[PDB]
Amino acid sequence: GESMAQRMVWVDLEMTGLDIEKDQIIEMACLITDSDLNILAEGPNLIIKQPDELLDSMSDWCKEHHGKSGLTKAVKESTITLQQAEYEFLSFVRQQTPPGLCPLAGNSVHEDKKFLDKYMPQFMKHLHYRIIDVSTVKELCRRWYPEEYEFAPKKAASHRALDDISESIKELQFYRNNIFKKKIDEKKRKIIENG
Ligand code: NA
């Protein structure tokens, strides 16, 4: 019960840009973790068809980054509509999390949430309204733990959805292991009794 409710729905998107009024989702990946960040299930990892005219009018940043990663070409070749993609993700979370209870998780995942609330509303209805924003923890680490912040893992930052999810989980695990309070565990308790 409570273990299921404490799962996390990790999502990362690529979009044609940051303009919620015009830009569209072009890539989406999703992983489920337990409350302790262990990966329980890998969800769909999908490249979503969007029109040539939209791709051709992307900002230079998006043209350069989605171009060199291969994403732009893959979007043009995709046969997956937004609606079919949403169904794959919704079916996946229905198999993995109790309705309404689990949050989106990722770096600045409120941006993904803005796009998903608009373009995948039925997927979002399965989730809690709260988020696990790894970048909130990043911003607190930089302020409160500046020495530890220097040791956070370097990111490849490939702007491909599934790879970036994995780096987000690793960043949050780094914070848990380095800036949160230490606790007892099964191994430490046995040592205390032996001593
Ligand atoms: Na992102």
Numbering used by the authors: 4 to 198
Q: Which passages does the manuscript contain on this structure?
A:
Among them, Oligoribonuclease (Orn) is unique as its activity is required for clearing short RNA fragments, which is important for cellular fitness. Here, we show that Orn exhibits exquisite substrate preference for diribonucleotides. While other cellular RNases process oligoribonucleotides down to diribonucleotide entities, Orn is the one and only diribonucleotidase that completes the terminal step of RNA degradation. From this we propose a general model of RNA degradation, wherein a combination of exoribonucleases process oligoribonucleotides down to diribonucleotides and Orn completes RNA recycling by cleaving diribonucleotides to nucleoside monophosphates.
(A) Crystal structures of REXO2 bound to pApA and pApG. The structural overview (left) shows a C-terminal helix that is unique to Orn orthologs in higher eukaryotes and in the current crystal forms is stabilized by crystal packing contacts. Residue numbering for REXO2 refers to its cytosolic isoform lacking the mitochondria-targeting pre-sequence. Structures of OrnVc (and REXO2) with different diribonucleotides, including di-purine, di-pyrimidine and mixed substrates, revealed identical binding poses. Additional hydrogen bonding between purine residues and Orn in the 3' or 5' position correlates with a small, but detectable preference of OrnVc for purine-containing substrates. Together, the structural analysis uncovered Orn’s mode of substrate binding, which is conserved from bacteria to humans and indicates a unique selection for linear diribonucleotides with a 5’ phosphate.
